[PDB]
Design a binder for this molecule. Structure first.
Ligand SMILES: *[C@@H]1[C@H](O)[C@@H](O)[C@H](OCCNC(C)=O)[C@@H](C(=O)O)[C@H]1O
Ligand SMILES: *[C@@H]1O[C@H](CO)[C@@H](O)[C@H](O)[C@H]1NC(C)=O
Ligand SMILES: *[C@@H]1O[C@H](CO)[C@@H](O)[C@H](O)[C@H]1NC(C)=O
Ligand SMILES: *[C@@H]1O[C@H](CO)[C@@H](O)[C@H](O)[C@H]1NC(C)=O
Lengths: 384, 73
């Protein structure tokens, strides 16, 4: 990595893009601009805030990316203590900026190594008080060595649970109650795994990450990347949406903010993975009290899920995602309820059509698939 | 046989995630790309982005700490 610059231009295209797309821009400032004492030099940041203010830009902030490897990356070491002080300086600047009441997230540390723990604890002791959320990074796999088996391995999915627990251990010890965000996550680091990070197979990891994040008290999950060079992109180099895009759209439509719990009876519960929220109520098909179950089947056979009492006679809308052949799980195309998902045109997304199941049927989930099930007229008071 | 019983907790919400729970990054790397302007210009791309609204968009990545703002450019 060498120093590159960027213009008032770059800022503007980025802003209008987020602005125009109904998205909330968080901007990461360069934390390697150091003074002789290796305090953060804030002069450059001042120019950018000044410009952004001048334009009336609603923007949130971060400072640094994965500070843990600054030594490997820039042959500079910065401890969490200093980095916490640096976050206080920037916070003061935002208070004196025109966006006094903008949000400030950090420190975008990599996943729980022993050293990463220490950096985050000491950063939170130091700067904990000025950040609106704690951002940390997760990847399951090295993009260079990831295999198809890895993407299908419940033993790989399950490691993420411990990751979250270690993070919540550091936070509860220093800033209990502080919201925790994943600031950058995907299947695999080094840009992703060719023919895996961009396929239907990517969706096991992605949906389970969402399931576990929501269950374990992660408030926001930031997917590396919406689009870009990396194989983990939701949209490819031709502006076509890959299966993870379709998966993200469907989740967005069906799954409410109120997080519940499902689990499977039996000592084995690793290959059949189940999550439960209140239904996204915005959806005019669905009313207050409805439940959205989503389930991942990593068995090589279909499994039939029975809803517990008193939900065993409800009308269930199925939303089952399976790959468009011939490349099965290595396919970049996906069918909902056996209809292929494609843009209608550059301007237009398709309807996402349910398949009502007969009331009282078990929920069929084929080998190597994932589905949502909306339980209609569940009348759950927690979701009302 | 391949039949599995589910247990559900429904008494109360265990968590509230953000409406922006499912959020996305643009790598800071992408601003070293010449086509950057063309790319975020794409109305197709904007359509796809609007479908994930609401969401946070994090502009950040390794290059976050190797980028310098120039008002002169
Ligand atoms: C997190 C980093 O912040 C990312 O910048 C990095 O991605 C590098 C390439 N990304 C593109 C071209 O979209 C990522 C990774 O290693 O994949 C993480 O380390
Ligand atoms: C920070 O940046 C300014 C502008 O380049 C520079 O002149 C100054 O010497 C730096 N400050 C410190 C304290 O090192
Ligand atoms: C952390 O860094 C500061 C300078 O920012 C230094 O003075 C302090 O003593 C350091 N502490 C440890 C244990 O690294
Ligand atoms: C599923 O996996 C087992 C491994 O014990 C294998 O031997 C079995 O034949 C597979 N069943 C299929 C493909 O239906």
């Amino acid at each position: 990595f060498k120093n590159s610059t960027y213009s008032r231009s770059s800022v503007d295209v980025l802003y209008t893009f987020a602005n125009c797309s109904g998205l909330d821009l968080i901007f990461g400032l360069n934390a390697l601009l150091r003074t002789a004492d290796l305090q953060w030099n804030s002069s450059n940041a001042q120019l950018l805030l000044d410009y952004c203010s001048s334009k009336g830009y609603n923007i949130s902030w971060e400072l640094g990316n994965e500070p843990n490897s600054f030594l490997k990356k820039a042959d500079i070491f910065i401890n969490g203590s200093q980095l916490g002080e640096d976050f206080i300086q920037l916070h003061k600047l935002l208070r004196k900026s025109t966006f006094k009441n903008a949000k400030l997230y950090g420190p975008d540390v990599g996943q729980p190594r022993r050293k990463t723990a220490k950096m985050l604890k000491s950063f939170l002791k130091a700067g904990g008080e000025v950040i609106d959320s704690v951002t940390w990074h997760h990847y399951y796999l090295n993009g260079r060595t990831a295999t198809r088996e890895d993407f299908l391995n419940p033993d790989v999915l399950d490691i993420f649970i411990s990751s979250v627990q270690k993070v919540f251990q550091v936070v509860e010890s220093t800033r209990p109650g502080k919201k925790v965000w994943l600031g950058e996550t995907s299947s695999a680091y080094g840009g992703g795994a060719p023919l895996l990070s961009d396929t239907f197979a990517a969706g096991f990891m992605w949906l389970d990450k969402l399931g576990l994040s929501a269950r374990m008290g992660i408030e926001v999950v930031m997917r590396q990347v919406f689009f870009g060079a990396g194989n983990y992109h939701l949209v490819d180099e031709n502006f076509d949406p890959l299966p993870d895009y379709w998966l993200s759209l469907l989740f967005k439509k069906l799954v409410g903010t109120k997080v519940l719990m499902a689990s499977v009876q039996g000592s084995k519960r690793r290959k059949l993975r189940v999550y439960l929220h209140c239904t996204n109520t915005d959806n005019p098909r669905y009313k207050e009290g409805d439940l959205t179950l989503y389930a991942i089947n990593l068995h090589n056979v279909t499994k039939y899920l029975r809803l517990p009492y008193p939900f065993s006679n409800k009308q269930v809308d199925k939303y089952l995602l399976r790959p468009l052949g011939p490349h099965g799980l290595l396919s970049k195309s996906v069918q909902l309820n056996g209809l292929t998902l494609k843009m209608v045109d550059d301007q237009t997304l398709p309807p996402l059509m349910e398949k009502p199941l007969r009331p009282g049927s078990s929920l069929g989930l084929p080998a190597f698939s994932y589905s949502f099930f909306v339980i209609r007229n569940a009348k759950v008071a927690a979701c009302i | 046989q391949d039949v599995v019983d589910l247990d559900f907790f429904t008494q109360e919400p265990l968590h509230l995630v953000s409406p922006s729970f499912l959020s996305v990054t643009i790598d800071a790397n992408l601003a070293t790309d010449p086509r950057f302007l063309i790319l975020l210009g794409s109305p197709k791309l904007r359509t796809l982005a609007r479908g994930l609204s609401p969401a946070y968009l994090r502009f950040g990545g390794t290059k976050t700490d190797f980028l310098i703002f120039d008002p002169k450019k």
